Design a binder for this molecule. Structure first.
Ligand SMILES: [Co+2]
Length: 81
């Protein structure tokens, strides 16, 4: 499964800001965070680690479940490195 509807929230409960970028381990930009911490991600690999970037910096990372499949909405807890 490769396209994910990701609900992003940090460990502290906050939301990554509107306009943050989400990148794969490889460094590819799979999507951008919209409002309310929602990010549609393209070409995601199940099991990989994504980084969420804003303010010119990796702010936190998420672990895409190995069981992720296409068009799945899932919570991705974003934890600071
Ligand atoms: Co860019």
């Amino acid at each position: 499964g490769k396209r994910l509807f990701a609900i992003l929230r940090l460990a502290d409960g906050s939301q990554p800001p509107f306009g943050a970028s989400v990148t794969s381990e490889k460094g590819r930009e799979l999507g951008m965070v919209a409002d309310e911490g929602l990010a549609w991600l393209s070409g995601v690999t199940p099991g990989e680690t994504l980084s969420v970037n804003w303010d010119g910096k990796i702010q936190c990372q998420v672990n895409v479940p190995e069981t992720a499949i296409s068009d799945q909405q899932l919570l991705l807890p974003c934890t600071p490195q």
